[PDB]
Amino acid sequence: EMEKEFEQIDKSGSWAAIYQDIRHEASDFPCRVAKLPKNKNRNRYRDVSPFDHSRIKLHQEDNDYINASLIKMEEAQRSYILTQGPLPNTCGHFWEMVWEQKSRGVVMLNRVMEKGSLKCAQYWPQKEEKEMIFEDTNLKLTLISEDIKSYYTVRQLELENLTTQETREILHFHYTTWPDFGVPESPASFLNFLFKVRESGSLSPEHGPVVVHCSAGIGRSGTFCLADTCLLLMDKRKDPSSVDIKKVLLEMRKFRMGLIQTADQLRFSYLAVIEGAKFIMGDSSVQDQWKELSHED
Numbered sequence: 389e390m391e392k393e394f395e396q397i398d399k400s401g402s403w404a405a406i407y408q409d410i411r412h413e414a415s416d417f418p419c420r421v422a423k424l425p426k427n428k429n430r431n432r433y434r435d436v437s438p439f440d441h442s443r444i445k446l447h448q449e450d451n452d453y454i455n456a457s458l459i460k461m462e463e464a465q466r467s468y469i470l471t472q473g474p475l476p477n478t479c480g481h482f483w484e485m486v487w488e489q490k491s492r493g494v495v496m497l498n499r500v501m502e503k504g505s506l507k508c509a510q511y512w513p514q515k516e517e518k519e520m521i522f523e524d525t526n527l528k529l530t531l532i533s534e535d536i537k538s539y540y541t542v543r544q545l546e547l548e549n550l551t552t553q554e555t556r557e558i559l560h561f562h563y564t565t566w567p568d569f570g571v572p573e574s575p576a577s578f579l580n581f582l583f584k585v586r587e588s589g590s591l592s593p594e595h596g597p598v599v600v601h602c603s604a605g606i607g608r609s610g611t612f613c614l615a616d617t618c619l620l621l622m623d624k625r626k627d628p629s630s631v632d633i634k635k636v637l638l639e640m641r642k643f644r645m646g647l648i649q650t651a652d653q654l655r656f657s658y659l660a661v662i663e664g665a666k667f668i669m670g671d672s673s674v675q676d677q678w679k680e681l682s683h684e685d
């Protein structure tokens with residue numbers, strides 16, 4: 389049981405130790421392509437790169453590199469593309485990936501500016517009348533509408549492949565109150581947001597994997613994916629006890645390094661999954677409670 393283990397680690401005050409053990413056991417694969425001199429300016433962080441085996445390849449001959457990893461959870465049967473928050477020069481690559489991978493949703497877990505620094509380019513239009521055109525990948529992006537809430541915003545964009553003139557609806561889920569190297573204000577705020585993403589259909593298997601990103605694409609992004617996969621696993625079996633959170637996280641780290649970044653985010657993951665299990669195990673009323681508790685209005 390994850391809940392018993394939680395209170396065992398909490399009483400013995402050893403989350404740091406548990407987290408470091410995961411760091412010590414985590415997979416280590418080469419990131420040769422990411423470290424090529426020509427891709428120096430395609431990486432936001434020198435120490436955060438995609439493994440070659442799970443990296444997302446852009447469908448072009450020039451340079452097919454982008455700092456993004458395909459987290460393919462086999463047993464859970466859901467995939468996510470964990471990526472860099474995009475740079476001024478890679479916004480075109482970012483949407484190229486979204487188009488080629490057939491994603492329907494983009495989950496942004498950071499703010500463009502955090503602690504005085506620009507953690508991410510402005511890679512989507514903030515105003516309907518001001519559409520963006522990414523000349524390097526031949527794509528146009530238009531803000532169609534947006535539903536602003538207390539701590540997250542949901543944007544409808546239209547992505548058009550200018551080459552074929554085909555268009556697609558991309559849903560943008562922006563969490564604006566998740567501090568970097570930090571955790572949500574409560575498991576309710578988080579679960580409420582996670583459920584807005586789920587309800588949108590964006591995570592459905594009929595779509596390409598959902599794109600998830602904070603700034604480095606591993607701290608907050610990892611925390612979000614871990615909670616989701618863990619809920620989906622126990623959901624498939626309707627058995628909360630058959631889910632090993634640390635084991636699931638290690639598994640995720642086979643596809644991208646550094647997933648979840650502090651011991652507190654790991655602790656929060658447990659907390660969110662434990663709270664979310666109530667819904668999965670058939671108490672539907674908690675959903676309305678998380679919404680109340682989150683104060684999205």
Ligand SMILES: O=C(O)COc1c(C(=O)O)sc(-c2ccc(O)cc2)c1Br
Pocket residue numbers: 433434435436507567568569570602603604605606607608609646649
């Ligand atoms: O998303 C988070 O929780 C934190 O994300 C972040 C950063 C940020 O957003 O400023 S920097 C960062 C990082 C950590 C270790 C490194 O060697 C290089 C970069 C991570 Br990881």
